[PDB]
């Protein structure tokens, strides 16, 4: 999740539109088969 | 005198040991 936070801060510094930061930033949606 | 943490001082851990099977 911290990796996603760093990438979103990267995209913020680059000046493009970034999703607002919430509690669902990095969370596994499901197991993958 | 005693409370729920310090009473744990009077508990022993060496009486009812099961038989130990060696290797």
């Amino acid at each position: 999740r911290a990796w996603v936070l760093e990438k979103k801060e990267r995209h913020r510094r680059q000046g493009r539109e970034v999703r607002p930061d919430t509690q669902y930033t990095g969370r596994k949606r499901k197991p993958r088969f | 005198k005693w409370d729920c943490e310090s009473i744990c001082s009077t508990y022993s851990n060496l009486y009812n040991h099961p038989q130990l099977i060696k290797y």
């Binding site: - | 005693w2 409370d3 729920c4 943490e5 310090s6 744990c8 508990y11 022993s12 851990n13 060496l14 009486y15 009812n16 040991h17 099961p18 038989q19 130990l20 099977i21 060696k22 290797y23």
Partner: protein, 329 residues
């Protein structure tokens, strides 16, 4: 007749309470909370706090066995059975075995038509110890199963009736007791049983009134060690009726005054994540002043966790009644 229906309804009520409020127990208004909860302690963190595996062992653990290295013992016995050639009857020979002291009932059973099989035990497999077996509930049976009621265990060619304990299947050092067998995940049944080396399948049956055994579980014998400890957890609830800045006055968790003094060294917590510590009793009615990390809302409920090491009950019965043939209700 109808008392069975009343008990079934009461068990259903307890099951829904347990799934809705896990371990919250109301404080008894008549008995002191430092007496009914005398054999309890508090843990700062359930996973990381220590607990001695040899502490306060009952009379029952004076009667069982334990392996110094169960992994190496399995390796030794299995290499001995695959490598060494024992001077005995070899596979395929039609042998007759004279076995000494057996009741006549099996002979009668053999003229009924019941299959009678035998198997030779591995070394150390007749001695009793604590069997930890992993189970999961099949959806065919949805009746409530309480933690320490008697069940029929099929484990590795062996049938026996006994009363287990249900524990969480986690990777931590100590595991929380499950008071009910929840039908969504895998749990651990802990029981007194003779030693059996894994792999072995684990069938759990519940005896119905009409004589049928209903299947409730399925799984494998995880391990044979009494060092696995079950931890019964009791949660006491309190109402913070006066709120201040980083300070609260809490009632209804205790009722005596020395109950507050007895349970002072246990860290408190709330339903909304805010932790805190209990400062001091107010007086004569169980009211307490507590210091938290933040402000508390009026709808919040203060919670307290108490832990006690629980152990299985010695109800080993090598007799299982022969059922009537099963039919769908």
């Amino acid at each position: 007749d109808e008392e069975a229906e009343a008990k079934m309804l009461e068990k259903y009520k307890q099951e829904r309470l347990e799934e809705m409020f896990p371990d919250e127990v109301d404080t008894p208004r008549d008995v002191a909370a430092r007496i009914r909860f005398q054999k309890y302690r508090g843990l700062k963190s359930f996973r990381t706090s220590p607990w001695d595996p040899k502490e306060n062992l009952p009379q029952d653990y004076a009667r069982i066995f334990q392996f110094q290295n169960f992994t190496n013992t399995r390796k030794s016995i299995f290499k001995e059975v695959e490598e060494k050639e024992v001077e005995g009857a070899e596979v395929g020979w039609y042998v007759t075995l004279h076995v000494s002291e057996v009741p006549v009932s099996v002979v009668e059973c053999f003229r009924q038509g019941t299959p009678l099989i035998a198997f030779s035990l591995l070394p150390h497999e007749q001695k009793m110890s604590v069997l930890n077996m992993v189970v999961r509930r099949d959806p065919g049976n949805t009746e409530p199963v309480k933690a320490k009621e008697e069940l029929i265990f099929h484990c590795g060619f062996r049938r026996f009736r006994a009363s287990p304990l249900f524990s969480q299947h986690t990777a931590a050092d100590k595991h929380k007791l499950q008071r009910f067998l929840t039908a969504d995940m895998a749990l651990v049944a802990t029981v007194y049983a003779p030693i059996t080396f894994p792999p072995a399948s684990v069938l759990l049956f519940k005896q119905k009134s009409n004589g049928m055994h209903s299947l409730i579980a399925t799984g494998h014998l995880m391990s044979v060690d009494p060092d696995r400890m079950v931890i019964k957890r009791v949660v006491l609830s309190g109402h913070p009726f006066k709120i201040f800045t980083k300070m609260a006055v809490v009632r209804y968790m205790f009722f005596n005054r020395e109950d507050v003094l007895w349970f002072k060294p246990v860290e408190l917590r709330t339903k909304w994540g805010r932790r805190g510590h209990i400062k001091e009793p107010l007086g004569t009615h169980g009211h307490m002043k507590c210091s938290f990390d933040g402000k508390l809302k009026s709808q919040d409920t203060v919670l307290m966790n108490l832990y006690k090491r629980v152990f299985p009950k010695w109800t080993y019965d090598p007799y299982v009644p022969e059922p009537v043939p099963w039919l769908k209700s």
